[PDB]
Amino acid sequence: MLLREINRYCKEKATGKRIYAVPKLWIPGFFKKFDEKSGRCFVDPYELGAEITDWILNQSREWDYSQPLSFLKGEKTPDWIKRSVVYGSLPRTTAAYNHKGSGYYEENDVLGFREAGTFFKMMLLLPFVKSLGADAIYLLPVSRMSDLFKKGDAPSPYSVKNPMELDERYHDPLLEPFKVDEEFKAFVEACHILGIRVILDFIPRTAARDSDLIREHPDWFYWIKVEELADYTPPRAEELPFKVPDEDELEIIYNKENVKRHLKKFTLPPNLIDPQKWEKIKREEGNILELIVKEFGIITPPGFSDLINDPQPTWDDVTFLRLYLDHPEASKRFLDPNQPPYVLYDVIKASKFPGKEPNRELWEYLAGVIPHYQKKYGIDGARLDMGHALPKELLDLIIKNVKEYDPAFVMIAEELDMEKDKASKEAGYDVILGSSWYFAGRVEEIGKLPDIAEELVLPFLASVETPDTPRIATRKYASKMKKLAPFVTYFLPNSIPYVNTGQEIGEKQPMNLGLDTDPNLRKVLSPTDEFFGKLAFFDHYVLHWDSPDRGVLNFIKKLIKVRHEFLDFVLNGKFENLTTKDLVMYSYEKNGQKIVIAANVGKEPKEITGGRVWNGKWSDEEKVVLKPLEFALVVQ
Amino acid sequence: MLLREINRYCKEKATGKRIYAVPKLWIPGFFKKFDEKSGRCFVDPYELGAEITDWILNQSREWDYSQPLSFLKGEKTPDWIKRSVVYGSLPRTTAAYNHKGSGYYEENDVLGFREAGTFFKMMLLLPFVKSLGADAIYLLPVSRMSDLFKKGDAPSPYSVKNPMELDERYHDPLLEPFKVDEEFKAFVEACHILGIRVILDFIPRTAARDSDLIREHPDWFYWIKVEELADYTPPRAEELPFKVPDEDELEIIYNKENVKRHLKKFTLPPNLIDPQKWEKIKREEGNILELIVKEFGIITPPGFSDLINDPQPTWDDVTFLRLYLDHPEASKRFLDPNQPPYVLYDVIKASKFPGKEPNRELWEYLAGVIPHYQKKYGIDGARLDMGHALPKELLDLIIKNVKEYDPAFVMIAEELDMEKDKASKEAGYDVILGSSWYFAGRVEEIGKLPDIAEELVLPFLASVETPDTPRIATRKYASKMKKLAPFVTYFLPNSIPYVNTGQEIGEKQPMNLGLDTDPNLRKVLSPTDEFFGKLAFFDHYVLHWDSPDRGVLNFIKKLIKVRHEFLDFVLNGKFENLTTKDLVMYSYEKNGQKIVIAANVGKEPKEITGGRVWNGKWSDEEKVVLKPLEFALVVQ
């Protein structure tokens, strides 16, 4: 058992030399071997790793933890997600920390330590995640990442250079004798022993500009003349709305002069241009894409939105995969004979404008990426990104394959529109993402959440912030909303409590400016802060473990625990909305008993029926008076 | 001739393919082969390089341009600096630009281009520098740089890993067939042909933490136990002033408990600890410092200020060189027998607390670094940093060696205090740095400059901003002061007009927060600017060539040109100060003629004698009325 091999190894290596820095919150209650100097703590990483793996191993029995927990439990349906509490993380950021204990952060330092996040450290933190009450960890893409066309000094987990491999950067030099796929397998074993499920993320429709799949399948990508790289942009048509075009508009779009110039920028794959040259380079050392640019003067195009007239820039670190061998059926009568394969709004949304020839070989590869992870590591679920673009048959196949191996596997749809619950369920998903974080952070909008949740036909991730949005700690009335918003949101019907990495310690700086974000959030930190202006998605970033918001940490822990003490009401109690202009409120009744969730978002205080009351602490009084921005859980 | 070999090469390579982006200001008037799309311009770098080197080569005669211009001119004294106009630059930043022409900047891109600055590009820009009127280029350290203990993704030119080598990063991949020392030699040839002198920068007293000199001379550095790295800081003594301690204070300092704990952190060199181990590792592949840390558990200490109680942090990317074999004489009677070599305030200022045994072998090496550049490339002068710390005999030697080879060589002292002119001249320097930029940017202080300049016994670099200070474009009343400050400063007595790279196009963002800088300057750019918050000294940064302040560019060019039209008055005319509370003003008279420099820094307008008047344009009127923040050059 790998987790045990790593334990053995740490004991051999122990020396008692404390020079590896970690934040005080990473040190569990049972660990005592550490020095405390200047605010931070120092340890022998081998002693820390040995005592923590001991703590985890001693809770195991005699089963195989390298398979889904659904197996050890005998589950045949995905009902488990409805009783779970999710902790969302980007390993690279969550586990980063300057282990030198002085000066500036470094990807790798002179003491031999990897300061960036690793699977080994993600394991040392399991006792912390567990203390938050979470029983499932969701991770952003951890597959191999491209280092071309970056925005900052770190790649985006979303430009997948190889869907079948993990990024070697997640390997920790402290465990020299081990490989990355082992460290990860050992990580998943540790989570299972502790009762913690693992959910990964994948994006089928795209790939890095220099995807590893290019050497053996150059014809799975599109190509354009290098001299056309600089001005490659999605052809606009101002007189048309800002949306994904319908059938009628295609006839107009294809008759535009700029669209016609666009279509003319594409070429045939390097293999079909010069068979001998292809075979020469294909077998050379060096980046596949640099070689092709230099030898064929062609390159893969950057991606872009499938809505015409979208003002967002082009996605330079990714390209699209060629889903069909032929061009879209509904658009063939507009093309010139001999038109090479090209990218346009319709080609991108294959779910709406498909050709008549599925690239069967690619489709099978795609449908075997998740199963590869289920069988190899025993993961319990996954989130599928950009599903809107996949043809119904390719999606039906992707799901049949994971469900065939484990009927308890949970598929999460990257669906932000809560009204698309019905269509997501019809496609075969078990959970939708939703957008509760937008209403949760606005006193004037939070009251809409109760009715929105009740109508759902699938459960959703009840969040107050995610990796793409601003932190709850920076919304209006933060000092109050950072506690009020999660209390109201985590108790909603059909909910799956979501805790974003860093939220539990009150982090302010956003990880990315994606959804509903203001460029000025880029400067919430002090200009003397080492990480001022940095965004975790494209730059090296360490969360503020040394100066945490203890008030938020302590409240999140207690809130999750009380919410779980009443899970039965949330799941099977009859819901009744009681929300007013100035009072968000609702109730659950089950077997003669009743609980009430209440929050005052008005300008004047309000009073309500009492009983046993919770608001961070338990009290007992007949009448409860809620001043503005105060909340309570009443038990009658 | 290398410059000619590079020319030949560019012509062979030319192809007419325009895909390499450069800013419109980099394209000279004679060059016509370029496409202009979206604001920027595209060219075949080989055609641009061929036509520009042709333009430079055609102005040459038959002499050897790989030696100082003083030779071709027959000069025996450093009088030339007094008639010069200096352009200051950090090559890495000055010549950086995203040659892809879209997306984000990358140290090296997929088209094969190095976007960071190179000697090749510093050559293509010579026609631009020349159009500013500059005839000498000053460069910050370009020696090999350490990549350990960095603040951002780019190293500081000041942590010298090898004083005798140039950093391989200045090589341009476009010139594959050539080596870095050639490209540089060719760069210096080009400057000489054009009449442009070259001045380099060196720091004798320090070295990178992992200096290349460690393998053959481990005993030229100091060492401390790895376990003492985290808390290594300069021992404070609050009851004492914030200054470099004198003799009496040493007796007190050495009796302090924290100082004694400090002295105990040091060890003997790795060669003297385990002779066999040293010889083993010394011959291994990999970073010398990582190897020593791992094998001897010791490391070089970070540097720090020589003034006790200084609040600035420690200098982690540099360490000090062991100048004496023994400990400081005046402090031996306070040490315990067997005290290893250690770093403290007195050891750092060797000029004041010397031992009795000079490390002769190091001293000779140090005294041969500049000559190595004079003889190998033909440089014309140099700035010596941290000269305050060098023993009088080691400095006397460093100067005798450059002056012996070229008696016309100009030595520049890194002396910010204009009252230390007399002592700098006595030490053997020809120019002092000064601090005119501080007064130049404050309407209430600028009037002091006239008297300050007149008393000098050496010329100074007349600047309104430098790499370590805020940009003139961000001081109070910027829109007016960015033109008024240089006009008043460049005409001062004993002046050497200085133009900081980026100043000529009105750059705002500082390069570093060193001298007199406010952390909030870190955010003068828009939060949507690719380089928001970045500092060129430790991060990749591209100056704003695409959105330049044309008003400042045009005025700087005309100002330098008019100042040079009257150089004779500045240099040999009798000076007379006429400054008042609200009017900075002075005159030069020579052979019955007179010129007057005037600027109104008051609240009410003022009038003065007219004649022929300059203020950006020439006019003629008997009386000149100066409103607040207006200036003029009057010729009677």
PDB file of N, CA and C in Angstrom, chain A residues 17 19 37-38 42 100-106 110-111 147-151 153 226-227 229-231 287 289-290 293 299 316 519-520 522-523 527-528 532 534, chain B residues 17 19 37-38 42 100-106 110-111 147-151 153 226-227 229-231 289-290 293 299 316 519-520 522-523 527-528 532 534:
ATOM      1  N   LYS A  17      15.803  17.662  12.505  1.00  0.00           N
ATOM      2  CA  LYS A  17      16.273  18.991  12.079  1.00  0.00           C
ATOM      3  C   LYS A  17      15.076  19.883  11.608  1.00  0.00           C
ATOM      4  N   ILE A  19      13.857  22.924  10.014  1.00  0.00           N
ATOM      5  CA  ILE A  19      14.186  24.057   9.148  1.00  0.00           C
ATOM      6  C   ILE A  19      13.154  24.260   8.037  1.00  0.00           C
ATOM      7  N   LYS A  37       9.053  30.380  16.059  1.00  0.00           N
ATOM      8  CA  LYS A  37       9.882  31.585  16.000  1.00  0.00           C
ATOM      9  C   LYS A  37       9.227  32.592  15.053  1.00  0.00           C
ATOM     10  N   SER A  38       9.260  33.860  15.440  1.00  0.00           N
ATOM     11  CA  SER A  38       8.711  34.909  14.650  1.00  0.00           C
ATOM     12  C   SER A  38       7.345  34.703  14.033  1.00  0.00           C
ATOM     13  N   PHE A  42       8.510  25.774  12.632  1.00  0.00           N
ATOM     14  CA  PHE A  42       9.473  24.963  11.902  1.00  0.00           C
ATOM     15  C   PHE A  42       9.453  23.481  12.323  1.00  0.00           C
ATOM     16  N   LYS A 100      11.238  28.278   3.476  1.00  0.00           N
ATOM     17  CA  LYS A 100      12.518  28.796   3.981  1.00  0.00           C
ATOM     18  C   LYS A 100      12.293  29.507   5.310  1.00  0.00           C
ATOM     19  N   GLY A 101      11.099  30.098   5.451  1.00  0.00           N
ATOM     20  CA  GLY A 101      10.745  30.828   6.655  1.00  0.00           C
ATOM     21  C   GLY A 101      11.225  32.276   6.707  1.00  0.00           C
ATOM     22  N   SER A 102      11.691  32.814   5.571  1.00  0.00           N
ATOM     23  CA  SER A 102      12.156  34.206   5.456  1.00  0.00           C
ATOM     24  C   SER A 102      12.270  34.603   3.977  1.00  0.00           C
ATOM     25  N   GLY A 103      12.324  35.909   3.710  1.00  0.00           N
ATOM     26  CA  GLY A 103      12.432  36.388   2.340  1.00  0.00           C
ATOM     27  C   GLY A 103      11.223  36.131   1.451  1.00  0.00           C
ATOM     28  N   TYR A 104      11.464  35.970   0.149  1.00  0.00           N
ATOM     29  CA  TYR A 104      10.392  35.757  -0.817  1.00  0.00           C
ATOM     30  C   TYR A 104      10.185  34.317  -1.240  1.00  0.00           C
ATOM     31  N   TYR A 105       8.946  34.028  -1.620  1.00  0.00           N
ATOM     32  CA  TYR A 105       8.542  32.741  -2.129  1.00  0.00           C
ATOM     33  C   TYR A 105       9.335  32.389  -3.413  1.00  0.00           C
ATOM     34  N   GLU A 106       9.590  31.089  -3.621  1.00  0.00           N
ATOM     35  CA  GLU A 106      10.308  30.542  -4.808  1.00  0.00           C
ATOM     36  C   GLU A 106       9.703  29.197  -5.155  1.00  0.00           C
ATOM     37  N   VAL A 110      16.767  26.755  -2.314  1.00  0.00           N
ATOM     38  CA  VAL A 110      18.115  26.229  -2.120  1.00  0.00           C
ATOM     39  C   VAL A 110      18.266  25.160  -1.024  1.00  0.00           C
ATOM     40  N   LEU A 111      17.202  24.945  -0.256  1.00  0.00           N
ATOM     41  CA  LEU A 111      17.202  23.968   0.818  1.00  0.00           C
ATOM     42  C   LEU A 111      16.645  22.650   0.252  1.00  0.00           C
ATOM     43  N   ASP A 147       2.985  25.288 -21.118  1.00  0.00           N
ATOM     44  CA  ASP A 147       3.695  26.478 -20.677  1.00  0.00           C
ATOM     45  C   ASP A 147       3.832  27.526 -21.795  1.00  0.00           C
ATOM     46  N   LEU A 148       3.008  27.409 -22.833  1.00  0.00           N
ATOM     47  CA  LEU A 148       3.013  28.372 -23.948  1.00  0.00           C
ATOM     48  C   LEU A 148       1.817  29.335 -23.854  1.00  0.00           C
ATOM     49  N   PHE A 149       2.024  30.576 -24.302  1.00  0.00           N
ATOM     50  CA  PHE A 149       0.959  31.582 -24.286  1.00  0.00           C
ATOM     51  C   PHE A 149       0.383  31.823 -22.857  1.00  0.00           C
ATOM     52  N   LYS A 150       1.263  31.975 -21.874  1.00  0.00           N
ATOM     53  CA  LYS A 150       0.838  32.219 -20.495  1.00  0.00           C
ATOM     54  C   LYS A 150       0.576  33.700 -20.227  1.00  0.00           C
ATOM     55  N   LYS A 151      -0.253  33.993 -19.224  1.00  0.00           N
ATOM     56  CA  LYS A 151      -0.518  35.378 -18.870  1.00  0.00           C
ATOM     57  C   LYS A 151       0.481  35.852 -17.834  1.00  0.00           C
ATOM     58  N   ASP A 153       3.589  34.084 -14.696  1.00  0.00           N
ATOM     59  CA  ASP A 153       4.616  33.045 -14.564  1.00  0.00           C
ATOM     60  C   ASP A 153       4.124  31.613 -14.269  1.00  0.00           C
ATOM     61  N   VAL A 226       1.065  31.085 -40.213  1.00  0.00           N
ATOM     62  CA  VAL A 226       1.731  31.864 -39.188  1.00  0.00           C
ATOM     63  C   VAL A 226       1.558  33.390 -39.405  1.00  0.00           C
ATOM     64  N   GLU A 227       1.695  33.857 -40.640  1.00  0.00           N
ATOM     65  CA  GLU A 227       1.553  35.290 -40.935  1.00  0.00           C
ATOM     66  C   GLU A 227       0.163  35.852 -40.618  1.00  0.00           C
ATOM     67  N   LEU A 229      -1.379  34.986 -37.669  1.00  0.00           N
ATOM     68  CA  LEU A 229      -1.500  34.832 -36.206  1.00  0.00           C
ATOM     69  C   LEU A 229      -1.901  36.140 -35.482  1.00  0.00           C
ATOM     70  N   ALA A 230      -1.124  37.192 -35.716  1.00  0.00           N
ATOM     71  CA  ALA A 230      -1.335  38.497 -35.095  1.00  0.00           C
ATOM     72  C   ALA A 230      -2.744  39.064 -35.141  1.00  0.00           C
ATOM     73  N   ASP A 231      -3.378  39.029 -36.308  1.00  0.00           N
ATOM     74  CA  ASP A 231      -4.728  39.575 -36.481  1.00  0.00           C
ATOM     75  C   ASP A 231      -5.864  38.538 -36.502  1.00  0.00           C
ATOM     76  N   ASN A 287       9.895  21.040 -28.516  1.00  0.00           N
ATOM     77  CA  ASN A 287       8.448  21.298 -28.511  1.00  0.00           C
ATOM     78  C   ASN A 287       7.816  21.066 -29.882  1.00  0.00           C
ATOM     79  N   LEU A 289       5.139  22.075 -31.279  1.00  0.00           N
ATOM     80  CA  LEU A 289       4.599  23.274 -31.936  1.00  0.00           C
ATOM     81  C   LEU A 289       5.665  24.222 -32.468  1.00  0.00           C
ATOM     82  N   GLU A 290       6.777  24.359 -31.769  1.00  0.00           N
ATOM     83  CA  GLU A 290       7.836  25.220 -32.289  1.00  0.00           C
ATOM     84  C   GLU A 290       8.375  24.638 -33.617  1.00  0.00           C
ATOM     85  N   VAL A 293       5.918  25.189 -36.510  1.00  0.00           N
ATOM     86  CA  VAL A 293       5.907  26.595 -36.929  1.00  0.00           C
ATOM     87  C   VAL A 293       7.123  26.830 -37.813  1.00  0.00           C
ATOM     88  N   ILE A 299       0.445  27.104 -37.608  1.00  0.00           N
ATOM     89  CA  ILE A 299       0.254  26.967 -36.154  1.00  0.00           C
ATOM     90  C   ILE A 299      -1.226  26.737 -35.834  1.00  0.00           C
ATOM     91  N   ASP A 316      -5.835  32.617 -25.926  1.00  0.00           N
ATOM     92  CA  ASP A 316      -4.555  32.211 -26.508  1.00  0.00           C
ATOM     93  C   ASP A 316      -3.870  30.941 -25.997  1.00  0.00           C
ATOM     94  N   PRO A 519     -12.024  44.778 -12.246  1.00  0.00           N
ATOM     95  CA  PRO A 519     -10.559  44.900 -12.287  1.00  0.00           C
ATOM     96  C   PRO A 519      -9.949  45.561 -11.050  1.00  0.00           C
ATOM     97  N   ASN A 520     -10.716  46.415 -10.368  1.00  0.00           N
ATOM     98  CA  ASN A 520     -10.184  47.054  -9.167  1.00  0.00           C
ATOM     99  C   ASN A 520      -9.986  46.102  -7.981  1.00  0.00           C
ATOM    100  N   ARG A 522      -8.354  43.679  -8.153  1.00  0.00           N
ATOM    101  CA  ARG A 522      -6.963  43.333  -8.360  1.00  0.00           C
ATOM    102  C   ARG A 522      -6.080  44.070  -7.335  1.00  0.00           C
ATOM    103  N   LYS A 523      -6.630  45.079  -6.662  1.00  0.00           N
ATOM    104  CA  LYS A 523      -5.807  45.783  -5.692  1.00  0.00           C
ATOM    105  C   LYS A 523      -6.299  45.887  -4.265  1.00  0.00           C
ATOM    106  N   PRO A 527      -0.125  47.601  -0.830  1.00  0.00           N
ATOM    107  CA  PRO A 527       0.947  47.643  -1.827  1.00  0.00           C
ATOM    108  C   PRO A 527       2.298  47.127  -1.294  1.00  0.00           C
ATOM    109  N   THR A 528       2.380  46.847   0.006  1.00  0.00           N
ATOM    110  CA  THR A 528       3.607  46.305   0.570  1.00  0.00           C
ATOM    111  C   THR A 528       3.495  44.790   0.761  1.00  0.00           C
ATOM    112  N   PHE A 532       0.738  41.461  -3.735  1.00  0.00           N
ATOM    113  CA  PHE A 532      -0.135  42.538  -4.225  1.00  0.00           C
ATOM    114  C   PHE A 532      -0.373  42.403  -5.710  1.00  0.00           C
ATOM    115  N   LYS A 534      -1.461  39.965  -7.537  1.00  0.00           N
ATOM    116  CA  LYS A 534      -1.377  38.626  -8.139  1.00  0.00           C
ATOM    117  C   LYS A 534      -2.682  37.826  -8.153  1.00  0.00           C
TER     118      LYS A 534
ATOM    119  N   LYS B  17       9.438  38.051 -44.989  1.00  0.00           N
ATOM    120  CA  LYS B  17       8.292  37.619 -44.170  1.00  0.00           C
ATOM    121  C   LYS B  17       8.131  38.532 -42.909  1.00  0.00           C
ATOM    122  N   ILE B  19       6.560  39.200 -39.690  1.00  0.00           N
ATOM    123  CA  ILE B  19       5.797  38.642 -38.571  1.00  0.00           C
ATOM    124  C   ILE B  19       6.407  39.000 -37.215  1.00  0.00           C
ATOM    125  N   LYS B  37      -0.381  47.350 -38.900  1.00  0.00           N
ATOM    126  CA  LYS B  37      -1.685  46.776 -38.564  1.00  0.00           C
ATOM    127  C   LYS B  37      -1.959  47.004 -37.076  1.00  0.00           C
ATOM    128  N   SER B  38      -3.201  47.343 -36.761  1.00  0.00           N
ATOM    129  CA  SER B  38      -3.607  47.564 -35.414  1.00  0.00           C
ATOM    130  C   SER B  38      -2.714  48.398 -34.522  1.00  0.00           C
ATOM    131  N   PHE B  42       5.041  45.474 -38.312  1.00  0.00           N
ATOM    132  CA  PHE B  42       5.666  44.174 -38.507  1.00  0.00           C
ATOM    133  C   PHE B  42       6.784  44.196 -39.566  1.00  0.00           C
ATOM    134  N   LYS B 100       5.359  38.921 -30.929  1.00  0.00           N
ATOM    135  CA  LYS B 100       4.271  38.148 -31.545  1.00  0.00           C
ATOM    136  C   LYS B 100       3.244  39.101 -32.146  1.00  0.00           C
ATOM    137  N   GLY B 101       3.110  40.275 -31.514  1.00  0.00           N
ATOM    138  CA  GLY B 101       2.159  41.278 -31.959  1.00  0.00           C
ATOM    139  C   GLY B 101       0.730  41.092 -31.458  1.00  0.00           C
ATOM    140  N   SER B 102       0.530  40.202 -30.477  1.00  0.00           N
ATOM    141  CA  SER B 102      -0.784  39.938 -29.868  1.00  0.00           C
ATOM    142  C   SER B 102      -0.611  39.158 -28.557  1.00  0.00           C
ATOM    143  N   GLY B 103      -1.648  39.158 -27.717  1.00  0.00           N
ATOM    144  CA  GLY B 103      -1.583  38.449 -26.448  1.00  0.00           C
ATOM    145  C   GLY B 103      -0.599  39.006 -25.427  1.00  0.00           C
ATOM    146  N   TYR B 104      -0.059  38.129 -24.581  1.00  0.00           N
ATOM    147  CA  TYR B 104       0.867  38.536 -23.529  1.00  0.00           C
ATOM    148  C   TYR B 104       2.332  38.304 -23.839  1.00  0.00           C
ATOM    149  N   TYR B 105       3.163  39.135 -23.221  1.00  0.00           N
ATOM    150  CA  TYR B 105       4.599  39.051 -23.313  1.00  0.00           C
ATOM    151  C   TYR B 105       5.100  37.684 -22.782  1.00  0.00           C
ATOM    152  N   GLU B 106       6.199  37.184 -23.362  1.00  0.00           N
ATOM    153  CA  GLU B 106       6.858  35.902 -22.977  1.00  0.00           C
ATOM    154  C   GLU B 106       8.354  36.062 -23.148  1.00  0.00           C
ATOM    155  N   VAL B 110       6.867  31.094 -29.234  1.00  0.00           N
ATOM    156  CA  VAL B 110       6.764  29.965 -30.153  1.00  0.00           C
ATOM    157  C   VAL B 110       7.214  30.234 -31.599  1.00  0.00           C
ATOM    158  N   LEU B 111       7.490  31.498 -31.907  1.00  0.00           N
ATOM    159  CA  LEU B 111       7.923  31.899 -33.234  1.00  0.00           C
ATOM    160  C   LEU B 111       9.462  31.912 -33.240  1.00  0.00           C
ATOM    161  N   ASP B 147      20.076  33.323 -10.097  1.00  0.00           N
ATOM    162  CA  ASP B 147      18.639  33.098 -10.115  1.00  0.00           C
ATOM    163  C   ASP B 147      18.112  32.567  -8.770  1.00  0.00           C
ATOM    164  N   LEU B 148      18.895  32.740  -7.707  1.00  0.00           N
ATOM    165  CA  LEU B 148      18.486  32.313  -6.359  1.00  0.00           C
ATOM    166  C   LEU B 148      18.052  33.516  -5.504  1.00  0.00           C
ATOM    167  N   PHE B 149      17.084  33.287  -4.613  1.00  0.00           N
ATOM    168  CA  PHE B 149      16.596  34.344  -3.725  1.00  0.00           C
ATOM    169  C   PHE B 149      16.059  35.582  -4.505  1.00  0.00           C
ATOM    170  N   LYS B 150      15.247  35.340  -5.529  1.00  0.00           N
ATOM    171  CA  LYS B 150      14.672  36.424  -6.326  1.00  0.00           C
ATOM    172  C   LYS B 150      13.397  36.986  -5.699  1.00  0.00           C
ATOM    173  N   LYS B 151      13.065  38.235  -6.026  1.00  0.00           N
ATOM    174  CA  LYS B 151      11.841  38.829  -5.514  1.00  0.00           C
ATOM    175  C   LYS B 151      10.691  38.555  -6.462  1.00  0.00           C
ATOM    176  N   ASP B 153       9.923  37.215 -10.962  1.00  0.00           N
ATOM    177  CA  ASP B 153      10.398  36.258 -11.967  1.00  0.00           C
ATOM    178  C   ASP B 153      11.688  36.630 -12.727  1.00  0.00           C
ATOM    179  N   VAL B 226      22.955  26.250   8.440  1.00  0.00           N
ATOM    180  CA  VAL B 226      21.667  26.297   7.777  1.00  0.00           C
ATOM    181  C   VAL B 226      20.504  26.548   8.772  1.00  0.00           C
ATOM    182  N   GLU B 227      20.518  25.879   9.918  1.00  0.00           N
ATOM    183  CA  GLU B 227      19.452  26.052  10.916  1.00  0.00           C
ATOM    184  C   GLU B 227      19.347  27.477  11.470  1.00  0.00           C
ATOM    185  N   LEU B 229      19.531  30.147   9.310  1.00  0.00           N
ATOM    186  CA  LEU B 229      19.157  30.958   8.136  1.00  0.00           C
ATOM    187  C   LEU B 229      17.909  31.842   8.372  1.00  0.00           C
ATOM    188  N   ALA B 230      16.820  31.205   8.788  1.00  0.00           N
ATOM    189  CA  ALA B 230      15.545  31.874   9.031  1.00  0.00           C
ATOM    190  C   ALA B 230      15.578  33.136   9.877  1.00  0.00           C
ATOM    191  N   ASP B 231      16.271  33.092  11.011  1.00  0.00           N
ATOM    192  CA  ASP B 231      16.349  34.237  11.924  1.00  0.00           C
ATOM    193  C   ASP B 231      17.648  35.057  11.850  1.00  0.00           C
ATOM    194  N   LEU B 289      25.869  25.974  -4.561  1.00  0.00           N
ATOM    195  CA  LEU B 289      25.281  26.274  -3.247  1.00  0.00           C
ATOM    196  C   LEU B 289      24.289  25.226  -2.758  1.00  0.00           C
ATOM    197  N   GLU B 290      23.515  24.641  -3.654  1.00  0.00           N
ATOM    198  CA  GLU B 290      22.596  23.594  -3.216  1.00  0.00           C
ATOM    199  C   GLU B 290      23.400  22.391  -2.669  1.00  0.00           C
ATOM    200  N   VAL B 293      24.887  23.129   0.788  1.00  0.00           N
ATOM    201  CA  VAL B 293      23.845  23.124   1.820  1.00  0.00           C
ATOM    202  C   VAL B 293      23.543  21.675   2.172  1.00  0.00           C
ATOM    203  N   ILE B 299      25.606  27.531   4.652  1.00  0.00           N
ATOM    204  CA  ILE B 299      25.247  28.400   3.519  1.00  0.00           C
ATOM    205  C   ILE B 299      25.850  29.795   3.710  1.00  0.00           C
ATOM    206  N   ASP B 316      18.743  39.486   0.621  1.00  0.00           N
ATOM    207  CA  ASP B 316      18.853  38.044   0.393  1.00  0.00           C
ATOM    208  C   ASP B 316      19.504  37.538  -0.896  1.00  0.00           C
ATOM    209  N   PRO B 519       5.404  53.273  -1.695  1.00  0.00           N
ATOM    210  CA  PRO B 519       4.794  52.016  -2.152  1.00  0.00           C
ATOM    211  C   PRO B 519       3.548  52.201  -3.019  1.00  0.00           C
ATOM    212  N   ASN B 520       2.834  53.314  -2.839  1.00  0.00           N
ATOM    213  CA  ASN B 520       1.647  53.545  -3.659  1.00  0.00           C
ATOM    214  C   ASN B 520       1.947  53.835  -5.135  1.00  0.00           C
ATOM    215  N   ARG B 522       3.505  52.019  -6.819  1.00  0.00           N
ATOM    216  CA  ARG B 522       3.384  50.678  -7.352  1.00  0.00           C
ATOM    217  C   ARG B 522       2.055  50.534  -8.117  1.00  0.00           C
ATOM    218  N   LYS B 523       1.134  51.479  -7.934  1.00  0.00           N
ATOM    219  CA  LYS B 523      -0.125  51.354  -8.649  1.00  0.00           C
ATOM    220  C   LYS B 523      -0.574  52.501  -9.530  1.00  0.00           C
ATOM    221  N   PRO B 527      -5.525  49.163 -13.676  1.00  0.00           N
ATOM    222  CA  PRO B 527      -5.570  47.753 -13.277  1.00  0.00           C
ATOM    223  C   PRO B 527      -5.808  46.792 -14.458  1.00  0.00           C
ATOM    224  N   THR B 528      -6.085  47.331 -15.644  1.00  0.00           N
ATOM    225  CA  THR B 528      -6.269  46.487 -16.815  1.00  0.00           C
ATOM    226  C   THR B 528      -5.004  46.469 -17.677  1.00  0.00           C
ATOM    227  N   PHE B 532       0.513  46.132 -14.787  1.00  0.00           N
ATOM    228  CA  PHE B 532       0.085  46.783 -13.540  1.00  0.00           C
ATOM    229  C   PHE B 532       0.842  46.228 -12.357  1.00  0.00           C
ATOM    230  N   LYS B 534       4.002  45.914 -11.736  1.00  0.00           N
ATOM    231  CA  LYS B 534       5.343  45.358 -11.963  1.00  0.00           C
ATOM    232  C   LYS B 534       6.498  46.358 -11.862  1.00  0.00           C
TER     233      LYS B 534
END
